[PDB]
Amino acid sequence: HDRALAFVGVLTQRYPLTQNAQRYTNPLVLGAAFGDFLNARSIDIFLDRLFYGPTQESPITSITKFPYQWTIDFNVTADSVRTPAG
Amino acid sequence: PPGFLNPQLINPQQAPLLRAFAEHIRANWPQPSEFGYGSTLQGSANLFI
């Protein structure tokens, strides 16, 4: 309950709700970002790419726009993403 | 590089400095010009220009 509320505060300090309620979150990015957060690891890199337009691409292809090692546990190539299973 | 050809291919939030640098180059690199010389009373010797 502590971590959940804190994570909400971060998500809302950026992206004010009234301007972003309609946007769709990328489940992959959301899962990775949340997992790092309660692992007491910084998550700033993920917040820039929390959303995606489902009518224009998949949650995968939305990520492959940035083909490089985002972080030590989240590595994405031009065609694929590697991460530990939750 | 295509990104150099079109700086819009570089995400600002992800690579700010590179995007700015490309736009700076594309905006401030000087424009070439031309001017005459010599005398019309003589041959030109120019090939392309």
Resolution in A: 3.3
Gap between the terminal Cα atoms of chain B: 29
Answer whether A48 touches B (CB < 8 Å): yes
Nearest residue of chain B to residue A66 (CA atoms): B14
Q: Contact A37/A10 with Cβ under 8 angstroms?
A: yes
Give the DSSP letter of residue A25: E
Q: Do A66 and B13 touch (CB under 8 A)?
A: no
Alpha-carbon distance A46 to A33, whole Å? 6
Find where tokens 């970002």 sit. A33
The coordinates were experimentally obtained by cryo-EM
Alpha-carbon distance A4 to A2, whole Å? 6
